[PDB]
């Protein structure tokens, strides 16, 4: 409801519909091309993209606004992984800023790159190309996987047909344990 | 419990500044004596002068409403669609 000025939401939060929709479309296309929506729920990524668009259209008054605050203002159920998607998308935007010259000199962060997100989307093609030159995978897999799928030792030792009866006896329940179980479950 | 939607009684029930503003927006040409007669003798002449000097200009002894009062900033020409600033400049 950030299109029409309603009594609750002030005019500062109200933003243009077409420009914000275009910004969200560009952000979600970036997420789809950077392996962010594949395997994960799309709606949290959409929420993160529209939140980033709403913050970038006016970074000044919305630097202190949080994801939960935005969800409360917009009357929308906050998705749980939306925060993680937002963090990953901001990391991708930081990588794009590092690829760019003036931004990498400015040394922005996950809080100051919101004002230059629009510039990041101007020539995002070469930026993403270079970023892939220097794959998006879950954080649990990018922790230096030195031993990928370790080969287990093949153990096909079968003997003749069995081993012995000692294991059978140690599996069989003793009369003492039988009586104890009967007393317990009486 | 057009711009002439408010009647004479509804006009008089409004403050003097709003009364003068609406009268100027409606007529756009009226002498000070006529304005005093329409507003009433119980209203002070200095008050009416202060009210009219902010929404009207003096042209050959008569009072003409300002251009911005007739053409707000968000309005436009009903015939050509040009912005209200150009209309105000032309009227001035």
């Amino acid at each position: 409801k950030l299109f029409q000025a309603s009594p609750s939401v002030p005019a500062k939060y109200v933003e243009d519909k077409e420009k914000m929709l275009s910004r969200t479309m560009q952000l979600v296309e970036l997420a789809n091309e950077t392996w962010l929506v594949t395997g994960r729920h799309p709606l949290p990524v959409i929420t993160a993209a529209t939140f980033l668009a709403w913050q970038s259209l006016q970074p000044a008054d919305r630097l202190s606004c949080s994801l939960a605050r935005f969800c409360k203002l917009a009357n929308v159920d906050l998705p749980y992984p939306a925060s993680s998607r937002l963090q990953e998308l901001l990391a991708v935007l930081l990588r794009m800023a590092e690829q760019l010259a003036w931004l990498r000199v400015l040394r922005l962060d996950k809080r100051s790159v919101v004002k230059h997100i629009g510039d990041l989307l101007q020539h995002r093609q070469s930026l993403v190309r270079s970023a892939f030159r220097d794959l998006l995978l879950p954080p649990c897999m990018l922790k230096s996987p030195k031993r990928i799928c370790p080969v287990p030792p093949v153990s096909t030792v079968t003997g003749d047909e069995n081993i012995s009866d000692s294991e059978i006896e140690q599996y069989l329940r003793t009369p003492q344990e039988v009586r104890d179980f009967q007393r317990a479950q009486a | 419990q057009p711009s002439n939607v408010l009647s004479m009684a509804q006009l008089r029930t409004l403050p003097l500044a709003d009364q003068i503003k609406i009268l100027m927006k409606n007529v756009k040409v009226m002498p000070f004596a006529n304005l005093m007669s329409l507003l009433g003798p119980s209203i002070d002449s200095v008050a009416v002068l202060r009210g009219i000097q902010k929404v009207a200009m003096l042209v050959q002894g008569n009072w003409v409403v300002k251009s911005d009062i007739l053409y707000p900033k968000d309005s436009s020409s009903p015939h050509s669609g040009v912005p209200a600033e150009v209309l105000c400049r032309g009227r001035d």
Partner: protein, 374 residues
Amino acid sequence: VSGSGGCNFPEYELPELNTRAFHVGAFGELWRGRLRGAGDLSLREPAADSDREDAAVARDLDCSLEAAAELRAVCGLDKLKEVIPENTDLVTLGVRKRFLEHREETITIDRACRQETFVYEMESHAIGKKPENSADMIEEGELILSVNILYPVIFHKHKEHKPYQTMLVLGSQKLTQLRDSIRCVSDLQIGGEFSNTPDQAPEHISKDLYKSAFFYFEGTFYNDKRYPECRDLSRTIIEWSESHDRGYGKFQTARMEDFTFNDLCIKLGFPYLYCHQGDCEHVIVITDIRLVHHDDCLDRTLYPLLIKKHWLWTRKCFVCKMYTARWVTNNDSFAPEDPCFFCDVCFRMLHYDSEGNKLGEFLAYPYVDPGTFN
């Protein structure tokens, strides 16, 4: 509209913060009723003396001098301790000597007590002053209300908040007198562009133009209707408050020339509003309600004389730094900064040539410095 039904006694609601709602006129009426007064005249004494007090005690409960003659002799000054306060087992005297040593360290003689002397003189201004006319004598038991006001932002939000002046008002007098007595800088402020005509005398100051003003006490809107150029912003306020169910109940509207301080229903220590000139808002804090006394100002004409006045720093001319600024310039190339300030001589000699022509393009306005009243 009748007042809120409540006891005259100001029962507390929050610990050491404020009391509950109560009336003012009934408060003063009950205050005068529960005692006889007749003591605000300073006629104690400038011969037969024993018989008069004998008759007095005869009307009193004891009708005897047995205790009187001894206690009046005991309670004297000839048996009372100038001399250096020492040679006695004390507690506060240690702090006193420490303060004396700290004073002898850096404080020189008797001075640097600016605010102290200010308070002293502003309190002495109301000591035993008689009215010019005999009909202006304040009657005994008149309500005196101390009211702090917080209009400005230009002060220290750090220093425990000492922003602005404090006033004294009389109950029987009208609220319009307090409205006109509040010395607001915005009243002296003048609007309009005078870059091309700097010598033109600024006419129709904001005080004369923007006559709209209204108080707000406990949901009651007092709008001034003394002048035919006063609008009603309380109309828009009520429209906003009623357009949505925001929890605010219906608010009453009244006139400022018909309701006095007595008819008000206030809470001592609770903030109320005084809004004029559209956005010029004053936070009104009525702190104390007291009766008149012979030591206080007995002249009804000049009682809104403040008991406290906050010092304000004037904005000096940015060029010479020797005179207080009187003009503010925006979009000025010759000015060093955008929010710039100049005095008369500097502005004339900088922004105008030897003949007075406007050198360069800029926007100049009459800068009414906040330090104009003092």
